Amino acid sequence: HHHMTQTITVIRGDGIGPEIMDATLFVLDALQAGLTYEYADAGLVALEKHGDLLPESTLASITKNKVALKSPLTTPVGEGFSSINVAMRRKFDLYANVRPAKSFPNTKSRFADGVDLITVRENTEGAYLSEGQEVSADGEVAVSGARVTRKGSERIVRYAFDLARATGRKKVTAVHKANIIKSTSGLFLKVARDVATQYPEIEFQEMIVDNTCMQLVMRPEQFDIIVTTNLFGDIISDLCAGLVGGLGLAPGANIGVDAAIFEAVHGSAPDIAGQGKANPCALLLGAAQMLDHIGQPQNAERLREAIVATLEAKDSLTPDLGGTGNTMGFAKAIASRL
Amino acid sequence: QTITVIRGDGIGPEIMDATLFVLDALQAGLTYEYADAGLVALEKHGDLLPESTLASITKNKVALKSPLTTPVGEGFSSINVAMRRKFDLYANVRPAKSFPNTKSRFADGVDLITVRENTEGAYLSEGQEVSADGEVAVSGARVTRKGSERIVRYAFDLARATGRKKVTAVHKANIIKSTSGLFLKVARDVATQYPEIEFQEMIVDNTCMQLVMRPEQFDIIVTTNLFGDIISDLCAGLVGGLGLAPGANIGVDAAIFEAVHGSAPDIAGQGKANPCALLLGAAQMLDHIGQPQNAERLREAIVATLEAKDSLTPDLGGTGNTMGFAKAIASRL
Ligand SMILES: NC(=O)c1ccc[n+]([C@@H]2O[C@H](COP(=O)([O-])OP(=O)(O)OC[C@H]3O[C@@H](n4cnc5c(N)ncnc54)[C@H](O)[C@@H]3O)[C@@H](O)[C@H]2O)c1
């Protein structure tokens, strides 16, 4: 008897993307998960290789396999093309961006072992809309817009409560700025209160985003599930990554009804690109989320325990964790504890 | 000289009581002209921002203001924002500085200033609409070359006046190319005119990760309205909480000194509130009106009261009360 082979799309990305994905696929091959990799290009590399930021072959590959493991993609700051991360999240309607932040041993984080939260970030609307961005002809006045829908808010908050119930956690906190941004953030919060009604055993808390960031750096232990809109969830999940030892230890799963793309929270880290310093643990923790999603919880747990045990033994840790190791050294250290 | 005093909402009254007690004990020579804004003015005369309040601030050019409540969702738009727009107080100056015995999760090396654009960005009433059927909502942000230029100039001029060495412009110009993009291009052009000051650019999410890992790297942070709101609340947390975070609304012709924190309705009226934030705001005010010696005496007294653990509010782990804490600070003036 063999296990079923499962094909996943693999996007190797830009900057540190290629080195951490080589490390990650090494560790997943050592796991013996029965995965076959179908490589696709997106963003910068896709544009130069196929003349298209998001090639039809990449869309067809993700549509067929319904699962991708993805390295970070660069999007240029200011003058240039629009985010292919956002474009893929919109195209596959991956509306739930699920970002757990959990204390690990022997990191450089300033916080003790009490952090254990999940950010559920709305992933398709809010302030991350390419449309409505305009600069006046004389370069004097720029406008940008945000859009929040009843349907979008409903499905993200229902995701957060269903996650609370499936995981046995007790509190969902809806994070907003509805005092100032009454239309969009306001609609999100009214829908969040309507949805909370249907899960009476789960504590529902509301909180303004600035207070939330202050509370996160003073008593991050109070938080369980945080549900919020696209931009706020972006800022909050990067802050929570800081609480548990930095971007090297923070995964983010983009979940939709028919498809899922698993990645790290972090970007392409151009300052260290190609120097073998990057921590591959964020992408490996995303691959662990992927393993839970595709029905291999025992292998997901095994990868997580291997990572924890490797940090516990301080074995071949990258510089971001206060080690002198390298990406592939760190990967081999984790592979050897499987 | 006369300053406009707005006693405000929730904890506003108790902390303003404590603050004015300490300013008297300091002998700053201030006369207090009381005005209402927000809920109190609304209740009394049916106007959130009465012409008498606008005339008080226009005349004195200096206000000391407690927190004003803004309803969450449907209801009036912020009277804090309304006064910042009306008086064009474009520079919101929020220093975040480590204090002793301060119950912060952090080291003792935080020393930075957030310079937050205070009149535009995403804090715009106009453009907020909901569809007839209640299904779709939209909101807008506006950024101008003029507004971006004046706030980045303020950041670089503040670096020179303070001896500080680095300005970091925080943005999301990768995703929000029009508004955040225009702010970032204006920041690069202004940096050009201050060649001895280090200029750094940093995306806002990276910046929040950096703030919780090594806040010591930051000197002056300059950013747009909403980002500066989030970042300055995160930095307050870095240095012991909202009890210790002042915020000055500075414009050319007027200035409003306040705490970063809101009306704190969960503790309002219980004498629990920490008055230090508003008192550090009053020290920014003393520096602004030409009383630097008295500003420094007030800061030293607050530092020495924290070092002594004398009558601290529960947010700093004490069991002292608002007035007690102010009296303890007054005692060391
Ligand atoms: N989902 C995505 O693909 C994604 C996410 C965030 C940013 N980006 C893109 O990445 C580019 C650069 O963004 P940025 O500089 O603001 O943030 P970044 O996430 O790429 O890096 C910020 C800091 O964290 C460090 N860092 C990140 N990941 C690390 C790792 N695995 N190991 C060690 N250190 C790590 C970097 O060296 C850097 O100093 C931008 O063009 C942005 O559009 C993409």
Ligand SMILES: NC(=O)c1ccc[n+]([C@@H]2O[C@H](COP(=O)([O-])OP(=O)(O)OC[C@H]3O[C@@H](n4cnc5c(N)ncnc54)[C@H](O)[C@@H]3O)[C@@H](O)[C@H]2O)c1
């Ligand atoms: N400039 C201002 O006047 C201002 C600023 C922020 C919020 N607000 C308004 O305040 C209201 C409440 O907002 P919020 O609850 O999100 O934020 P908040 O700042 O009022 O409260 C945050 C938390 O910090 C605590 N806290 C705040 N100030 C404190 C102090 N001085 N000492 C001890 N503990 C303190 C509170 O008890 C609360 O738990 C809202 O209506 C909002 O619109 C006004």
